[PDB]
Design a protein around this nucleic acid. Sequence first.
RNA 1: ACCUCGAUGUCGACUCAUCUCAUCCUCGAGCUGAAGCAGGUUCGAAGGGUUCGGCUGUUCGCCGAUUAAAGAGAUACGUGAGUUGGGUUCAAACCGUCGUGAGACAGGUUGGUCCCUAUCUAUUGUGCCCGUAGGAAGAUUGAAGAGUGUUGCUUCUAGUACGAGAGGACCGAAGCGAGGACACCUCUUAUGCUCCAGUUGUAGCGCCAGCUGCACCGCUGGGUAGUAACGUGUCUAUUAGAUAAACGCUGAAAGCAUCUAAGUGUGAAACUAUCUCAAAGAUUAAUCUUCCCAUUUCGCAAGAAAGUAAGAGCCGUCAAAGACGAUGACGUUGAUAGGUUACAGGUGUAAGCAUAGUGAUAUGUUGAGCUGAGUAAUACUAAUUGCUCGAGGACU
RNA 2: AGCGAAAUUCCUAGUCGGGUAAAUUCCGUCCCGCUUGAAUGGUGUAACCAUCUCUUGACUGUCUCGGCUAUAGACUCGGUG
Lengths: 56, 73, 119, 122, 115, 37, 229
Amino acid sequence: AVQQRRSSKHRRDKRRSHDALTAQALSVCQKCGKKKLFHRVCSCGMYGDLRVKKAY
Amino acid sequence: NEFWYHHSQYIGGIKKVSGRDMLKKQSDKLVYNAVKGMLPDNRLSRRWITKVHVFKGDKHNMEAQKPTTLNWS
Amino acid sequence: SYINKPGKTSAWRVMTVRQQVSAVLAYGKIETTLKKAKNTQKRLDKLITLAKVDNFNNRRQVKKWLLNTNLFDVDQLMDHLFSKVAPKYEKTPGGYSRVLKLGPRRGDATEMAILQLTD
Amino acid sequence: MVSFMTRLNVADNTGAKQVGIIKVLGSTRKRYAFLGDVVVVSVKDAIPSGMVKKGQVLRAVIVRTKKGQQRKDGTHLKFDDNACVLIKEDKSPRGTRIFGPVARELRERGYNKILSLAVEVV
Amino acid sequence: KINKQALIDLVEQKQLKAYVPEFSAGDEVNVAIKLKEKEKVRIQNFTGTVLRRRGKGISETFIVRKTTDGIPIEKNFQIHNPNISIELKRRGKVRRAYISYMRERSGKAAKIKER
Amino acid sequence: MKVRASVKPICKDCKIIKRHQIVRVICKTQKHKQRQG
Amino acid sequence: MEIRGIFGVKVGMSQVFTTNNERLPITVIYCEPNQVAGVKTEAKDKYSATLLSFDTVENKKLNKPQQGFFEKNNLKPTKHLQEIRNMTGFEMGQQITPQNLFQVGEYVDVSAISKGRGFTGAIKRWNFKIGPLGHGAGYPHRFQGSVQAGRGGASAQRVFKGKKMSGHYGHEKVTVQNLRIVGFDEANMLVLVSGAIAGPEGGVVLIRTAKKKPGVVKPIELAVQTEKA
RNA sequence: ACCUCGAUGUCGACUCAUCUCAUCCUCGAGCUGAAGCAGGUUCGAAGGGUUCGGCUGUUCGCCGAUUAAAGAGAUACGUGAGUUGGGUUCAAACCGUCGUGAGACAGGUUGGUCCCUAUCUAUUGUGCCCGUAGGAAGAUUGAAGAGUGUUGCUUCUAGUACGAGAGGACCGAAGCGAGGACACCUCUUAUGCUCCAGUUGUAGCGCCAGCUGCACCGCUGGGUAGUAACGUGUCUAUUAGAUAAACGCUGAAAGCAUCUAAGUGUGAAACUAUCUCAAAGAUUAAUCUUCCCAUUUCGCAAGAAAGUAAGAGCCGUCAAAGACGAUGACGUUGAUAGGUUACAGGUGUAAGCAUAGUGAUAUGUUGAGCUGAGUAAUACUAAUUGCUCGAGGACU
RNA sequence: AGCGAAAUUCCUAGUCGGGUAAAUUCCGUCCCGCUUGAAUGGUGUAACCAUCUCUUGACUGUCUCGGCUAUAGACUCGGUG
């Protein structure tokens, strides 16, 4: 439908208080120092030191 | 004469309880609602009513709080 | 609504899966979507464990599952798989390919993955 | 499964071709013509050489179900057609000699005459 | 945590029959029904062509197509049904587990068998 | 049993009572037993 | 009281032949021997219930607080713990079996968790009915209809609470009353339950002594075949 | 002619049904000019249920066909931000009539007439945060309660009671169980478009066998786990308390009778329940237990700094969850999941190798070929070397 | 003359048969004619209406009774919004 009365600006801010994403993971890479994500590849090209990607 | 009649937002189970039936299941909400019947709808209404700790026995859980032993308060 | 972009239809999905498995057989590794990468790994493992016989029967059967690409066509991918890809990894019970998770996409932040062939 | 006005077959010497369900009698609002229950049907096509003609409302006992139901016995209760016997307003059909398999679930309400009027019981 | 998904057949093995085949449906089988009649206890056979071959244990069903008194009957008979004896009679030349070209034949004829 | 707004002797012996705040006439014969008097 | 409870994991649905040469719909549930973590009285923790611990597994992913709970109640590490409501039996540290809790074919009540379907509307939850849609059906084609209760303040000016609107279907515990027990198998610690009981291929099942037909028993046990190859 | 025309969307239907019970039934008895087998009235009773269609368009109104029951009404003569315009009647036209006419009939008919991205609230589930009253950790007495809370059929009983006599059973027991709610995919099926097996070709893999992109899954058949009914399985009933209508016993008033007035009772699906339950955001923020520490030291105590030494979470193979998050099994330590063996289950004796059939096709290769969802073993792979939340018992 | 409740007629849900299991809507016919009725035509129209009133069959999910498979999606993530 459509709204009768406008949702407030502060009501909008309070409603949008839970649109943000959830927390993420952190992982230490032993060979190439970086705080990457869990079961992801770092910018150094390695998932947990398996050289599986290029430099970029 | 005085039964106890209640109807929340739920429908189809309108609660009508006799005096002897109240003694079988629950008795604290009796005095709870009786006292809250003298409380205006405000911020501390349901906060004022919790100060009326309704018990069916002579003891209470707040004996460690130094209760004033008296009668008819 | 009515007629518009078809999208990911079942026929299109299976054709894309065939194209991706042919691409991972030709180029070796493929950077694609994680859900597509895992299906491609599954099909590649099935093809590797099917091609250990190296007979015309598997040629005809896999003929319905490979789609030609830039480098390799269907019957050249046949010989490629039957010669080097399948026998190289048959020494182990499974694990003919590995999928690893990558970062998101620039414009659409799509979680991607990389699929490689290994023992 | 047979439902309201789901035309079903007649397999006895009655003089009618097709019968359509009008209601189900027995318990309250059965709404499904299963084996073991007598139903009321209407005839929209009937030869004038029998004792029943077009336009009348008769009764039938369904004895064969094409899709059928999962019978408690162990084998899926299944026939080759949704077949019934157009009865003469009782447990017995209008035919003097009954041909074809007869439902074994009819015993919950009777209908023993359909079985006893035939040499075999399937 | 731990899963087995093998007890599905185990519940059925306590009284599983030893026949329990897995073949190409389309054969001709006769199944007998022991009618414990008051007089002349009867063994009423129920013969017909197989149509579908399904079953995950004691639920190994198969459809038998008979015709009695001009009325046909396709019964989804269970192999392990008590008071039911099941035997396999004819193994015809069949390339499927669901055929219908055997159902469009006429009388006074015969079918070829597998070579 | 019944419903009325006044109860009077109906039969030869139809006594008038006040049962559950309801004035009634009840006879030794079960016929003449009304309510709501 | 009369409430005797057993737990298990449903490995799916099957079939088997019961007495009188009749087949019954069979849900197959594996049962692990239980051990009671507590008997809570109406004056102990204010509730009458029996907390049983089952599914003995490795302690790598368990709670050390739960481990000590087991120890001070003389138990072993278990994956699952559950309180049956309205009971005072099952003395602490007892390995219970369904043989002493039920009969082979007695009437019981079985609770089970439905297969997860996510947020499925009330039409598939409460099994509404739809009439004929011939000669036009409007812009939509599926809806549960009206919840009208007053417009303005005349009768309700609201929607009656408990209205059957779109929600969650599946993964909701359901109790079927007075169903007979098909078969036990203490060699493999397995149970067969009659009817079409809830549970995915991996769901859980609780069996309790019936409260309307506790002692009523009729045979649906395993039926020997009169013709075995 | 009023709150309402600087509008207050209505007829009817489908669905959702709820409610008061001046009751249809069930449940219960009285009264009975009730002969019995069954019951006429009455109330208690909202607790549940309380027909399908052809036809005026439609439930309803005619007719046919149903059970113990197919309710007395409101919810804007319920419904329309859930649906429809069905006909009067739209924009057009006809038919009989009228008006010389625009046109009209408290006349009939066809063409043909309804928007909603839900802000809150009402409401169904899942959430983040915090409190969750030491962290974590399991479970609930409970606060506002709702749903099944409906119930028949068959047989014996028994030709005995009741009538008198034909008549003639409820009563007692048993099974089947119909709406409603509940769920399952086990049998069956529909599907299963990552399975197999046939199929007409375009067009091809240079060609042909085999198939290929495609042709409504290209066609349709069976079909993995399946999902759902096209199917299965349940239950209501009964009951405890107190009552109602009802029947009362002593028994007064009224020295006697006599349900209430003091005593002594039953009684219904009606109230709580009894069949099913669980919720402390119940801020009424709760109780118990457990692992941990409480290591001398610092908010209108977060027991400060060593804020774990205990636990959980992040994330992945995934679903057991699930709108999405969350939640949960397993995490190189492993069967938690993917792939391999066997394959479960299913398709259904692949193909050529040579022959038979002249040929479609088949045969030693064959229950092999295969299984996408799935199964027991299988590190072969994935789940990380990993990181985060995370205690000194708050306040009494 | 002819006509009929006929797109039509308060009485009228006309009536008879048929259609329809079921018929006020429909056909033929008798016709309670505010009101038929003769080129505002009475009136059958074989053929047919991109209109209609009703019945029905091969045939189908329109339905008794809906269900699964794939999706553009919606739910989620990202860009604009």
